[PDB]
């Protein structure tokens, strides 16, 4: 409720670049804080690459120009090794055009992960169009950059990891371990992959496209009855296993007859610990997930978004409003059924499409939560709701409601489709919120006050 | 200490807004020598005892005035807009704040009512053998519907998948033939209107016999995009204001909103028509619709859906039925052989049941239904909204009660049986002051 909603700072990217599709805090030291903004439709200087996508670095202290692009990869699409001579024709081996690089953006310390969920290649054998996805990892503050495409393997096509789309979702652990979601592995069963920055580096070898990180953790293929589950559609991290190694929270939005479910995996050996089911068919239970302690007891609590949750009005009319489910963790474990639920009020508003912990916004000893409804509001420009944590979890009513100040253009703003909080960039001792709105290629940052 | 007294009505207008059983006195000498003016408002029976004649007790009551009551059709050619299946069609209810107004609603199922049927078929590779027996669906279904109605029009449409990665292979080869070399599969496509509604069942057979099967990658297919277009593209499909049956025939699950994000489709379905040469053009731009969206567009366009799916996917589409009003599910065979009988059984279940829905009401305004069906089964609560087991020519009635608490100006909402164009216009007026 203390967020300076009346005077937020606005960032602007190139038109039609989906600037603000992904947002993140960056701090390679207490001094030199910056805001990262993904723009997966941005054109780049890469030769022969149409709209490769780009990530922007926006240092605090705007004047004159804040944002500039991080050059992860200056090279265009590489050529097929076994076809440069050939008869006639030089075939590209990979396809970086329309790869949506910067669709996902995450950072930890002086490390930056940026993913291209629609990157695809051919393989050095039979011609395919496998969207394996790829990621670029910047470490030690840009002094070296590594490509990481753990789905680009020997196992091609849909039956394998060909359509994995690794990087569709991603996250860092509090120790800097990389965690990727790929919802397309094994005929869209989905998959979670994870490696430490060290393992990725100690096996890096650009000459051979198919890289194999030694010691990589990854879920395995199941029987065909699990096809079309989209495991790894969303991802989060938190401690749920009673140790000091953070665990992997992963959405499986189309699992169990499309009722969907969320799963929690043991952070050490990626084995299953919990399962939580949706309550309505095709509500996309698992569209977004998050983990944070919302009642000040030390134990991280689970949050799940189902933005297509349909409900009935008092006068007997159905309506798509969306809903968010909150499961509290106890010393004994976690109850299979939600502790509380938050429901949207705007039809088609997609309440719960985005979630983020905010930390303790008001310094009242309880962490708070922001929930986005990208099509809420009287003009469907999008809305972000702030909910306060307390003795008994999240409050029923939101403490604050952030709406865009600009007028509604002829296309949606998607305000609140991408969120990120829990970091005090200005250093006033109060956490700050970064709200994206890629619909009009803008990204907003809100600032807390005492 | 009733509510009327313990509300201190300063004037007559206040006394009305607070309690329906209240009345305001205006006769001098009523007041005891030390009363407050907050006492002329009191229970109607109480004022008669305290010493207040009727002439000096204002107590406006809500009334009921019908404005249009065209009678239901009877036996002694008629266009469907001359046929009446519901009455009255318009009335005015004056609402005393706190008091309910009740009026009866007659429904009678018409006889020999026309039918439009659109057959929307999955032409993915998994439906290869199925397309072989639909060669004669046209004439054979035409012949079977003669028993039902003397006026039947049939149409045909097909669908496969969004024409973008990762739902299809994007290599120039697989774009030409999404199957293997053995097959001669046509190129993938979202939705096409093969044939608009018509009576010439001979056209149906020849056109279906000219359709080539297609293909794509993931098992669930994009039939929802097609369902949306069929629903909203009114005049291009040729929907008449009569019974509207959409047959949805597939052997696999369905894509829905959220899945577009895999292929970079973030923009929601707009619920608008986008046909170019009877081809859906914007499958690469708009996401799959959600279920809730389809419920909206199937209802406002009065579509009654028949899901004709295989045994394997019965439980999935059975739950889909529970969420979609006026729809039915039947078990389709491997060669789509029992499709005709499947359609007849589905029809007989949909037509033998009526369900009422009402438009948005203002705050304070509330509604409830009391149904009275054949053989004395009487529904209440939510069951009041519907009557089942209704044969042709059968009549049923609903006692609808509307109550208001708040005091907004003149409101208006419609009550309509799902599937039909005919509706009842309820106009509301609020008694906030004395007359």
């Amino acid at each position: 409720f203390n967020l300076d909603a009346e005077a937020p700072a606005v960032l602007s990217g190139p038109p039609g670049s989906f600037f603000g599709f992904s947002v993140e805090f960056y701090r390679p030291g207490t001094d030199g804080v910056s805001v990262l903004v993904g723009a997966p439709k941005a054109n780049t200087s890469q030769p022969g690459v149409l709209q490769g996508g780009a990530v922007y670095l926006c240092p605090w202290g705007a004047s004159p120009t804040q944002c500039t692009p991080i050059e992860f990869d200056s090279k265009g699409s590489r050529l097929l090794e076994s076809s440069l001579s050939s008869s006639e024709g030089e075939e590209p081996v990979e396809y970086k055009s329309l790869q949506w690089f910067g669709a996902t953006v995450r950072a930890h310390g002086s490390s930056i992960l940026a993913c291209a969920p629609l990157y695809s290649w051919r393989t050095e054998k039979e011609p395919l169009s496998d969207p394996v996805g790829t990621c670029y990892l910047s470490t030690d503050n840009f002094t070296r950059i590594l490509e990481y495409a753990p789905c680009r393997s020997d196992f091609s096509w849909a039956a394998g990891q060909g359509y994995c789309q690794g990087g569709f979702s991603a996250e860092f652990t509090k120790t800097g371990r990389v965690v990727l979601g790929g919802p397309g592995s094994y005929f869209w069963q989905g998959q979670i992959l994870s490696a430490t920055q060290e393992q990725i580096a100690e096996s890096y070898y650009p000459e051979y496209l198919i890289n194999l990180v030694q010691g990589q953790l990854q879920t395995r293929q199941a029987s065909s009855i699990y096809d079309d589950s989209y495991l790894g559609y969303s991802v989060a991290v938190g401690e749920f296993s009673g140790d000091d190694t953070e665990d992997f929270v992963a959405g499986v939005p189309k699992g169990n007859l499309t009722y969907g479910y969320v799963t929690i995996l043991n952070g050490s050996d990626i084995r299953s610990l919990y399962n939580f089911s949706g309550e309505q068919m095709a509500s996309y239970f698992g569209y977004a997930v998050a983990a944070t302690d919302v009642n000040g007891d030390g134990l991280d609590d689970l949050l799940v978004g189902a933005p297509l949750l349909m409900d009935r009005t008092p006068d007997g009319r159905p309506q798509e409003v969306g809903r968010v489910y909150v499961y509290l963790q106890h010393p004994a474990g976690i109850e299979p059924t939600p502790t509380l639920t938050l429901t949207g009020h705007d039809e088609f508003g997609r309440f719960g499409s985005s979630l983020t912990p905010l930390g303790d916004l008001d310094q009242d000893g309880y962490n708070d939560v922001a929930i986005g409804a990208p099509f809420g509001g009287e003009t469907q420009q999008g809305v972000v709701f702030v909910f306060p944590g307390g003795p008994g979890g999240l409050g029923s009513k939101p403490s604050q409601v952030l709406q865009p100040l600009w007028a509604a253009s002829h296309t949606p703003d998607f305000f609140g489709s991408a969120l990120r909080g829990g970091r005090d960039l200005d250093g006033n001792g109060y956490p700050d919120l970064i709200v994206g709105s890629f619909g009009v290629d803008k990204a907003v940052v809100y600032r807390g006050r005492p | 200490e009733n509510r009327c007294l313990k509300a201190n009505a300063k004037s007559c207008g206040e006394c009305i807004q607070a309690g329906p059983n209240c009345g305001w006195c205006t006769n001098s000498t009523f007041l005891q020598e030390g009363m407050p003016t907050s006492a002329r408002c009191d229970d109607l029976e109480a004022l008669k005892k305290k010493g207040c004649p009727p002439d000096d007790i204002e107590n406006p009551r809500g009334s009921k005035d019908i404005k249009k009551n065209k009678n239901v059709t009877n036996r002694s050619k008629l266009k469907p807009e001359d046929i009446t299946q519901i009455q009255p069609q318009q009335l005015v209810l004056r609402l005393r704040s706190g008091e309910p107004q009740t009026f009866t609603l007659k429904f009678k199922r018409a006889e020999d009512y026309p039918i439009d049927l659109y057959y929307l078929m999955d032409l993915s590779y998994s439906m290869k053998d199925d397309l072989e027996n639909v060669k004669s669906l046209g004439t054979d279904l035409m012949n079977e519907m003669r028993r039902i109605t003397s006026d039947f029009r049939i149409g045909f449409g097909s669908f496969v998948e969004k024409t973008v990665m990762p739902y299809i292979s994007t290599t120039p080869a697989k774009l030409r033939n999404p199957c293997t070399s053995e097959q001669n599969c046509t190129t993938p496509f979202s939705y096409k209107n093969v044939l608009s509604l018509t009576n010439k069942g001979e056209v149906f057979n020849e056109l279906v016999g000219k359709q080539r099967i297609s293909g794509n990658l993931d098992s669930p297919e994009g039939g929802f995009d097609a369902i949306m277009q069929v629903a909203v593209c009114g005049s291009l499909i040729g929907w008449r204001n009569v019974t509207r049956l959409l047959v949805f025939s597939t052997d696999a699950g369905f894509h829905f909103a959220g899945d577009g994000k895999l292929g970079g489709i973030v923009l929601p379905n707009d619920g608008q028509c986008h046909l170019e040469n009877n081809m859906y053009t914007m499958s690469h731009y708009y996401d799959y619709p959600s279920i809730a969206h389809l419920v909206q567009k199937l209802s406002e366009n009065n579509i009654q859906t028949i899901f004709a799916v295989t045994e394997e996917f019965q439980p999935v589409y059975k739950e889909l039925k529970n969420l979609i009003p006026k729809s039915a599910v039947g078990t389709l065979s491997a060669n789509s052989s029992n499709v005709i009988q499947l359609i007849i059984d589905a029809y007989n279940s949909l037509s033998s049941e009526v369900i009422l829905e009402n438009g948005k009401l203002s705050e304070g305004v509330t509604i409830s239904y009391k149904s009275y069906c054949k053989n004395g089964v009487n529904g209440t609560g939510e069951n009041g909204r519907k009557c089942s087991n209704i044969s042709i020519g059968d009549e049923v009635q609903f006692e609808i009660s509307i109550t208001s608490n708040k005091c907004p100006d003149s409101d208006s909402f419609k009550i309509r049986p799902l599937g039909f164009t005919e509706e009842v216009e309820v106009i509301l007026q609020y008694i906030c002051e004395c007359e």
Binding site: A158, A159, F187, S224, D227 | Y125, K128, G215, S219
Partner: peptide, 8 residues
């Protein structure tokens, strides 16, 4: 086997 759109 038969997975996806009828891939045996």
């Amino acid at each position: 086997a038969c997975r996806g759109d009828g891939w045996c």
